[PDB]
Amino acid sequence: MQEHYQPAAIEPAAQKKWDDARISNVSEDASKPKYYCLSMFPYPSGKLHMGHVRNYTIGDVLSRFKLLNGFNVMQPMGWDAFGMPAENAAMKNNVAPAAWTYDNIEYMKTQLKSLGFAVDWEREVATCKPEYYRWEQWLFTKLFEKGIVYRKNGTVNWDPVDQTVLANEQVIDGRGWRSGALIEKREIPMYYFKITDYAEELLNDLDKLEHWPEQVKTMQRNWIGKSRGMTVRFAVSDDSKQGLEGDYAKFLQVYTTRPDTLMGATYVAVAAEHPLATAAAADKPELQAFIAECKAGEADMATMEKKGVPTGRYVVNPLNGDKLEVWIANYVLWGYGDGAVMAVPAHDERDFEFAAKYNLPKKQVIAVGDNAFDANRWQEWYGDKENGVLVNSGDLDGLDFQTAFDAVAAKLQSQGAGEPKTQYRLRDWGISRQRYWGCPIPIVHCEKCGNVPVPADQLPVVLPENVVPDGMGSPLAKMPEFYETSCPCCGGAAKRETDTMDTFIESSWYFFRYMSPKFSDGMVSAESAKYWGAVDQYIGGIEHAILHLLYARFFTKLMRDEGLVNVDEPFERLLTQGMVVCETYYDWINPADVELTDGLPVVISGTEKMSKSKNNGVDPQELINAYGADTARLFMMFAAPPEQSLEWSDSGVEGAHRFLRRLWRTVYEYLKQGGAVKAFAGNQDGLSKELKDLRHKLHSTTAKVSDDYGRRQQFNTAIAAVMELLNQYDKTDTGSEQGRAVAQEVLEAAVRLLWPIVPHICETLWSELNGAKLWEAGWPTVDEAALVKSEIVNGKLRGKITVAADASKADLEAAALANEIIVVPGRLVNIV
């Protein structure tokens, strides 16, 4: 054995060994229990970041842990290759997004390989490849025919100068990011997934995810935003009919989730586009100007100032006769149902602020205990939906929320003035992107037949990769060699859709493609979907906790309903790794290039998440080059729990390295002192106290690491536990024949316990210790016998009893009360 730890030498040799044994290239082996461990696949945007490495090391520790326990582990990787990063790289550097993408894939994959993750590179996918996206085109066509995907006009932000559709992330104060020109709102036909048809399924199925973080489930519940409420109609008054036609002449309709407060309404509010708004804004230009301000302006709703103007029109509350004025209010949106709401200032906080601004009335209709009500100050309990009881509500006084709900539902229904209704904040999923580098939408536009889907055997619609976009509209709409085609229905001349898909589509089903990424007759082969089932463990950042996860669960249910898979939920367990943060320097300098206290130094600034913004993300390549993959993986698993933020630390990197030198040194000095022997096993009576204690430390450590890997998923404490065993080992004379056998038992366990964290050094040290295959020896066992510890009358002594080392004060006093009560354990039990 070489005396000194050389990671730059041991690490490539170990990866070659693993690659040559194909331990990570798995099949659908029915003679082994499957384990599907998945880390969120990256955008190939150039080079791996330190955050990447943390995410993917975590996935690797869990995959390697399951593999040592005999599982058939699939840990796939791949490239979420479509989207804007490549388009800007095309604009900025005069190159095709495809070739820029494959260049990045090559570099990053080599980076990922050098970290030694146990990945099935035979299941790699690149989502920008026709091989992949043809199947999401296929699914699009099948759902389009069912109406699950549909086409209708939607609003986009048009920049008149750049001549391109803008996302709201690029419209700043109403103007184009790279232009400042005033943005126009234009109607254009776009494609949508009817995700609202699955809202109830997507909500209730969260209850099945017992192994998801509760906050992630809460974020999804709040996004779907289900509410059970009441449709309520207020008959338009006799004096307020001018210009009103149809049903709008008859009643103002409203959705409320608090119909138990209907007797406390003091006004109503309609959107600027509501017919009662535009009808009262005829002889009243003051309202015409407010209506103008509104369509000029959920994201900003909380932050914005709530404004309204009176209307002079009136409606009648169907429950208590009251005639209440309508208002036009900027907070009422035209499209979220009725476009009109009631207002109960005494029990809704926004209605309170609105009514306090304009001095509008507020009427208590709910009291909570003896809580004092004061109309001039809002208190949290005004909105209490659980401990309130109805006040000033005549026939409803004394009821609680649900009974009043059911009562007003019965009253309104019996008078025809309302009915219960379920609403959702969830909107349909808009697919269309007016950009180049993304999956083409498989629709052909024909003047006779309409918009028609591309037949299955004509898929894929191939995206031309010989394209350099220039931010002046999508190049596809200027490429007749792409959009000119024939109609698949009638054969006449026709045009391809030139919009591309939301790149969330690719990441909504890639976990299924991984099961059979060369299947050519469908999204995923039946045989593979049956074997792998669902992802047992998913690891990714919290920024994807809402949209990506909801889209992925939605696609899972769509694919199941198509008979392609037989699971309801894609991800069983979910782990959210914390960010990696790092000091900043300064414009801004990368930390690997600084005068750490060119010539005059820089300013040591603040610590924040590694990013391009402040140029503070350390290249994991400089870290691998300088210390090796195992030091990188060890540092990140040791510094903090995986969920906590990780602070970049030079001394922490050094400390991980020195610990690996120590592990190396410990094994060498053991084999220097007499070579390998058979590890201690079996009954341990006759072993010395010192060796019994070391074996106790050993098997306690195996139990704790197994729990930390398996149940708690806290790897930093697992490493600390293995450090304590080594410290104990260092304080133990293991020179005797029995001592050498226990020493071999300790080092053989420690090397396997750490193998998921630092597999290169542990693989190398293991083969110096033992001649078997490490993955066939498997995860260390807990020897329960090693955990059992040895056993330890009014004055004059009268007997003696054998006690368990874990016997409580009640057991000493019990055994004392049985031999032929003050108790000092280990010494005497004295019965007065």
The binding site for ligand LSU (CB under 6 A) comprises 40-43, 49, 51-52, 55, 80, 507, 540-541, 544, 548, 577, 610
The interface partner of residue 232, options being Zn ion, ligand LSU, none and the CB cut-off 5 to 8 Å by kind, is none
Return the number of the residue (454 or 634) whose C-beta is nearest Zn ion: 454
* SS3 call for 242: coil
- 695 closest CA partner among 664, 729, 671: 729
Nearest approach, Cβ of residue 76 and ligand LSU (Å): 12
Task: Note whether 487 binds Zn ion by CB under 5 A.
Answer: yes
The beta strand positions in 271-414, using DSSP E, are 308-316, 323-329, 340-343, 366-367, 389-390
**Which residue's CB is nearer to ligand LSU, number 6 or number 613?**
613
Residues 15 and 337: their CA atoms lie apart, in Å, by 59
Residue 232's DSSP bridge partners are 254, 418
Q: Which is nearer to ligand LSU, 40 or 564 (CB)?
A: 40
- The binder of 449, among ligand LSU, Zn ion, none, by C-beta within 5 to 8 A per type, is Zn ion
Distance of CA 251 to the CA centre of its chain: 44
CB of 539 to ligand LSU, least distance (A): 7
Closer residue to ligand LSU (CB): 324 or 610: 610
Q: Is 449 in the site for Zn ion (CB under 5 A)?
A: yes
744/754 Cα distance (integer angstroms): 16
Segment near Zn ion (CB under 5 A), from 87-95, 250-258, 389-397, 491-499?
491-499
User: Three-class SS of residue 388?
Assistant: coil
Question: Taking the complex as a whole, how short is the minimal distance between the CB of residue 590 and ligand LSU, in angstroms?
Answer: 14
Work out what residue 446 binds among Zn ion, ligand LSU, none; the CB cut-off runs from 5 to 8 Å by kind. Answer: Zn ion
389 binding partner (options Zn ion, ligand LSU, none; Cβ < 5 to 8 Å by kind): none
- E strand segments, 727-769: none
Measured from the CB atom, the residue of 113 and 151 that comes closer to ligand LSU is 113
Q: Which of 32, 323, 357, 448 binds Zn ion (CB under 5 A)?
A: 448
Q: Which does 489 bind (CB under 5 to 8 A by kind): Zn ion, ligand LSU, none?
A: Zn ion
Residue matched to tokens 């592990």: 663
The entry of ligand LSU, Zn ion, none near residue 426 (CB within 5 to 8 angstroms by kind) is: none
Partner whose footprint covers residue 490, from Zn ion, ligand LSU, none (CB < 5 to 8 Å by kind): Zn ion
Q: Give the interface segment with Zn ion, choosing from 3-11, 49-57, 166-174, 492-500 (CB under 5 A).
A: 492-500
Which residues partner with 309 through β-bridges?
328
Q: Toward Zn ion, which CB reaches closer, 487 or 559?
A: 487
- Indicate whether 451 belongs to the interface with Zn ion (CB under 5 A): no
Toward Zn ion, which CB reaches closer, 9 or 490? 490
Q: Which helix (H) or strand (E) covers residue 759, if one does?
A: helix 759-769
Of residues 49 and 217, the one with the C-beta less far from ligand LSU = 49
Q: How far is the CB of 149 from ligand LSU (least distance, A)?
A: 20
- Indicate the residue among 52 and 704 with the shorter CB distance to ligand LSU: 52
SS3 249: helix
Element spanning 75, H or E:
none
Measured between alpha carbons, how far is 507 from 377 in angstroms, rounded to an integer?
49
> Which of ligand LSU, Zn ion, none does residue 418 bind (CB under 5 to 8 Å by kind)?
none
Specify the pairing of strand 443-446 against strand 450-453: antiparallel
Residue 460 DSSP one-character state: -
Torsion of CA 716, 720, 726, 728, to 10 degrees: -160
User: Does 98 participate in binding Zn ion (rule CB under 5 A)?
Assistant: no
Give the distance between the most distant pair of CA atoms in the chain: 114
CA atoms within 13 A on the CB side of 516: 19
Region label for 243, one of left (φ > 0), alpha (ψ between -120 and 50) or beta (otherwise): left
End-to-end CA distance of the chain: give it in Å, rounded. Answer: 66
Place of tokens 């494959």: 102
- Span of 8-16, 439-447, 454-462, 515-523 interacting with Zn ion by CB under 5 A: 439-447
As measured in angstroms, the least distance from the Cβ of 83 to ligand LSU is: 9
Nearer to ligand LSU, 57 or 684 (CB): 57
CB of 117 to ligand LSU, least distance (A): 13
Report the C-alpha gap between 188 and 39 in whole angstroms.
37
Question: Smallest Cα–Cα separation from 4: which of 726, 672, 697, 735?
Answer: 672
To the nearest whole angstrom, how small is the minimum distance from the Cβ of residue 452 to Zn ion?
7
Question: Which 764-793 positions form the footprint of Zn ion (CB under 5 A)?
Answer: none
Give the dihedral sign, CA 490/496/497/503. Answer: positive
Binds 616: which of ligand LSU, Zn ion, none (CB < 5-8 Å by kind): none
Minimum CB–partner distance for residue 541 and ligand LSU (Å): 2
**Shortest Cβ 531–ligand LSU spacing (Å):** 23
Q: Which does 541 bind (CB under 5 to 8 A by kind): ligand LSU, Zn ion, none?
A: ligand LSU
Q: Which CB, 491 or 799, lies closer to Zn ion?
A: 491
Nearer to ligand LSU, 98 or 230 (CB): 98
Q: Do 48 and 105 contact (CB within 8 A), yes or no?
A: no
Instruction: Quote the least distance from Cβ 145 to Zn ion, whole Å.
Output: 16
Q: Which does 680 bind (CB under 5 to 8 A by kind): ligand LSU, Zn ion, none?
A: none
Q: Which two tokens stand for residue 218?
A: 């809460």
Smallest separation, CB 574 to ligand LSU (Å): 11
> Around 711, how many Cα atoms within 13 Å sit in the side-chain half-sphere?
5
C-beta of 38 vs 190, nearer to ligand LSU: 38
| 490 contributes a contact to Zn ion by CB under 5 A | yes
User: At closest approach, how far in Å is the CB of 137 from Zn ion?
Assistant: 19
> Judged by CB under 5 A, does residue 493 bind Zn ion?
no
Question: Quick one: 375 or 489, whose CB is closer to Zn ion?
Answer: 489
In angstroms, give the least distance from the CB of 433 to ligand LSU. 15
- List residues bridging with 235 in a β-sheet: 251, 316
CB nearer ligand LSU, residue 40 or residue 558: 40
Give the residue ranges of DSSP H helices in 241-318: 275-280, 285-296
What letter does residue 604 receive in the DSSP assignment? B
What CA–CA distance (Å, rounded) separates 480 from 680?
76
- The nearest distance, CB 449 to Zn ion, in angstroms, is 3
What SS3 class is residue 806?
coil
CA distance 3 to 765: 11
446 binds Zn ion (CB under 5 A): yes
42 binds, among ligand LSU, Zn ion, none (CB under 5 to 8 A by kind): ligand LSU
Rounding to the nearest 10 degrees, give the CA dihedral for residues 21, 27, 30, 31.
0
Smallest distance, Å, CB 373 to ligand LSU? 48
Please report how close the Cβ of residue 656 comes to ligand LSU at its closest, in angstroms.
Answer: 19
Q: Out of Zn ion, ligand LSU, none, which partner does residue 487 contact, by CB within 5 to 8 A per kind?
A: Zn ion
Residue 542 interacts with Zn ion (CB under 5 A): yes or no: no
Residue with tokens 């995810």: 209
Q: Which of 165, 143, 164, 162 is nearest to 154 (CA)?
A: 165
Query: Of the candidates 412, 74, 153, 79, which has an alpha carbon nearest to the alpha carbon of residue 259?
Result: 412
Distance, CA of 236 to chain centre: 48
**Calpha distance 127→523 (Å, rounded):** 13
Is the distance from CB of 740 to CB of 693 less than 8 angstroms?
A: no
Q: Is the peptide bond before 460 cis (omega within 30 degrees of 0)?
A: yes
Q: How far is CA 119 from the centre of its chain?
A: 21
Residue nearest to Zn ion (CB): 487
Task: Please report whether residue 488 would count as binding Zn ion according to CB under 5 A.
Answer: no
When binding is defined by CB under 5 A, the residue of 489, 604, 703, 720 that contacts Zn ion is: 489
Q: Kindly list the residues in this chain that would bind Zn ion in the complex (CB under 5 A).
A: 446, 448-449, 487, 489-490, 492
